[PDB]
Amino acid sequence: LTKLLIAEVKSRPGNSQCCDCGAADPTWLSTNLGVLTCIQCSGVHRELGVRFSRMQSLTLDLLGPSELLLALNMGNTSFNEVMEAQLPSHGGPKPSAESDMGTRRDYIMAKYVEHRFARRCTPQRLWTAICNRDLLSVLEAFANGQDFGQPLPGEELVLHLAVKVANQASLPLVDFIIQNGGHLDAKAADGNTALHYAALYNQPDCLKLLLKGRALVGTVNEAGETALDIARKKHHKECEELLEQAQAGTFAFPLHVDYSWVISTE
Amino acid sequence: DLTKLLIAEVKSRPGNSQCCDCGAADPTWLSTNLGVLTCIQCSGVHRELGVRFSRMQSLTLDLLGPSELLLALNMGNTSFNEVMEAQLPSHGGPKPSAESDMGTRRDYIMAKYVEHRFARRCTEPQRLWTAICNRDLLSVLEAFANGQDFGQPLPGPDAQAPEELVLHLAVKVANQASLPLVDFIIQNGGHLDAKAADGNTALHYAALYNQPDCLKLLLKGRALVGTVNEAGETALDIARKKHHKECEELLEQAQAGTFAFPLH
Numbered sequence: 001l002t003k004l005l006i007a008e009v010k011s012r013p014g015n016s017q018c019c020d021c022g023a024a025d026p027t028w029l030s031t032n033l034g035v036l037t038c039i040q041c042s043g044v045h046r047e048l049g050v051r052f053s054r055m056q057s058l059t060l061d062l063l064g065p066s067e068l069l070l071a072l073n074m075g076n077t078s079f080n081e082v083m084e085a086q087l088p089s090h091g092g093p094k095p096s097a098e099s100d101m102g103t104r105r106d107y108i109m110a111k112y113v114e115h116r117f118a119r120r121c122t123p124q125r126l127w128t129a130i131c132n133r134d135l136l137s138v139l140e141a142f143a144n145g146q147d148f149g150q151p152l153p154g155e156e157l158v159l160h161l162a163v164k165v166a167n168q169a170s171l172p173l174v175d176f177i178i179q180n181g182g183h184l185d186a187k188a189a190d191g192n193t194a195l196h197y198a199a200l201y202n203q204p205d206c207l208k209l210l211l212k213g214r215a216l217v218g219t220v221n222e223a224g225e226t227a228l229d230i231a232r233k234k235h236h237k238e239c240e241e242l243l244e245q246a247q248a249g250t251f252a253f254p255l256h257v258d259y260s261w262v263i264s265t266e
Numbered sequence: 267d268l269t270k271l272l273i274a275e276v277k278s279r280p281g282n283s284q285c286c287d288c289g290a291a292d293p294t295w296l297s298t299n300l301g302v303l304t305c306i307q308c309s310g311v312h313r314e315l316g317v318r319f320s321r322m323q324s325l326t327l328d329l330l331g332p333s334e335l336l337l338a339l340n341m342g343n344t345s346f347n348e349v350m351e352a353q354l355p356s357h358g359g360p361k362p363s364a365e366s367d368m369g370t371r372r373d374y375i376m377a378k379y380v381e382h383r384f385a386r387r388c389t390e391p392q393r394l395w396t397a398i399c400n401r402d403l404l405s406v407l408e409a410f411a412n413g414q415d416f417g418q419p420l421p422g423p424d425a426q427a428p429e430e431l432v433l434h435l436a437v438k439v440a441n442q443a444s445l446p447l448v449d450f451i452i453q454n455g456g457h458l459d460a461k462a463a464d465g466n467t468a469l470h471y472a473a474l475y476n477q478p479d480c481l482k483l484l485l486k487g488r489a490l491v492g493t494v495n496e497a498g499e500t501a502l503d504i505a506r507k508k509h510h511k512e513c514e515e516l517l518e519q520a521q522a523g524t525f526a527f528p529l530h
C-alpha cells in the first residue's frame with residue numbers, strides 16, 4: 001500500500017518539481033507540510049529544525065501511510081498557491097536547481113520561517129474553514145502567523161473544533177494542526193483536551209493522530225475524567241481500546257528505574 | 267507504588283515546596299520538559315505558552331510514570347531559578363506572589379520562559395562542549411536560557427574534525443547520570459532530526475554507542491525511525507552490526523510501530 005501511495009504522492013499537482021527551486025522529480029518529503037523537495041532544498045528544511053519541517057526521503061527512508069496523509073492531500077502547487085502567493089511570475093528570489101546554497105538558504109528561511117511570500121489575510125474565517133474542511137484556508141491562517149492557540153466563535157479551540165467535526169475527508173486538516181499548531185495540550189474551560197474531545201465525539205482516527213503527535217495521555221478534565229473514562233461511558237469501544245494501549249504505553253518507550261544504579265548512587 | 271516513591275522524591279527537591287514562579291506553597295503541577303513545579307494558577311499560564319515552552323501535568327491528578335519524571339528528579343525549582351531568575355533583585359522585583367492578579371502573573375511568566383528576560387547572562391561552543399562532557403545540566407540550561415541554538419555544531423577541545431552536533435555529543439557520552447541532559451536537549455533543543463556530515467542522526471548514534479536509554483528518550487521524543495545515513499544504514503542496521511541487542515529490539519519495535527495503528 002505504501003508503494004501505491006508514494007506513487008500517488010509523486011503524481012500530485014506540482015509534485016514533479018521541487019517545491020522550493022523547481023528541480024525535476026523531488027524525492028524528499030516534508031511530512032508535516034505535505035510538500036516534495038530536491039536533495040539540496042531538503043538539507044535546508046532539515047536545518048530549520050523539527051518545528052518547521054521534518055524531512056524523509058520517499059526513496060530511501062522507512063515510511064507508512066500515516067506519514068503520507070498530508071502529502072496525499074497537499075502537494076507542491078496547492079502549498080505554493082498560498083505560500084508563494086506574493087512571488088512575481090519571473091520567480092523573484094526563488095532559487096533554481098543550480099542555485100548557490102546561500103541563495104537557497106535565504107529563500108527557504110524567508111518562505112518557511114518568516115512566511116515572507118505567503119498570501120496576507122488578517123477568526124470566524126477560521127471556524128468556517130474548519131467546518132468547510134478547507135485545508136488550504138487552514139494553511140493560510142498558519143501562514144499569517146496565526147494562533148491556533150486562540151478560541152474561535154461560530155468558544156471552541158481550533159484543534160478541538162477540527163476534532164469534534166472531523167470525518168475521513170478532514171483528517172489532513174486535523175493532522176496539519178497537530179503537527180504545526182502551537183497548542184496540542186490546550187484545555188478549554190471545562191478542562192477537556194483534544195484527546196478528551198476525540199473520545200467524546202467518537203473520533204478514533206483523530207485519536208490515532210493525536211497519540212502519534214505525543215498528546216498527553218491520562219490527564220483529567222474539570223469533571224475529573226480521562227479521555228478513557230469518556231470513551232467507556234459513551235460505549236466508544238474503538239477509542240477505549242486505543243486509550244487503554246496508550247495508558248499501558250503500547251508504545252511511548254518508557255524508561256525504567258534501574259534499582260542497582262539508585263543504590264550505588266545514594 | 268513506584269511512581270508514588272518518585273513523586274515524593276520530586277516534591278522533596280530543593281525549592282519544590284513553593285511554586286517556581288510565584289512562591290505559592292506545595293505546588294503540584296509539573297512542567298515535564300523543564301522539571302519545575304508550579305501552583306494551579308501559574309500552570310494555566312505555562313500551558314497557554316504552548317507545547318514548545320512547557321507541557322503541564324498534575325502530580326496528583328494526571329497519570330505519570332518514571333519517564334515524565336526524569337527531569338523533575340534532577341532539576342527542581344531552586345536549581346532552575348538559580349539560572350532563570352539570576353537577574354532579579356532581592357526585593358521589589360517583578361516576581362508574582364500567590365495572591366497576584368493574572369495579568370501580572372502572565373506578564374512575568376512570559377518574560378521568564380519566552381523572553382528569558384531574567385536569566386543569568388553568558389556570552390560559546392567550548393563552554394557547552396565541556397558542560398555536556400561534564401554532565402552539567404545547569405550549564406546546559408544556562409546555554410538554553412541565552413538563546414543558544416542547539417542546531418549549530420560544536421567544535422571539541424582541539425583534536426578536531428569531529429565537530430559534533432549538541433544532541434549527538436550528549437548521546438555519545440551518555441551514562442545513567444547524564445540522561446536528564448539528553449532528555450532536556452531532546453525536549454527543548456530545536457533539532458532532533460539533525461544529521462551531521464556522514465548522515466547519522468542522534469538515533470543512529472544511540473545505536474552506535476549502545477545507548478538504549480537515549481534511544482527510548484529519542485523515540486518518546488518522536489525521532490524519525492528508519493532513515494538511512496550516507497552509508498545507507500538505519501539505526502537498526504547499526505545496532506545489528508555492533509550486536510547491541512537491547513538497541514536492536516527497541517528499534518525493531520519502533521519500525522513495527524510505523525505500521526500500527528493504521529487510520530481508516
Ligand SMILES: [Zn+2]
Nearest residue numbers: 018021038041
Ligand atoms: Zn529544490
Ligand SMILES: [Zn+2]
Nearest residue numbers: 285288305308
Ligand atoms: Zn504560582
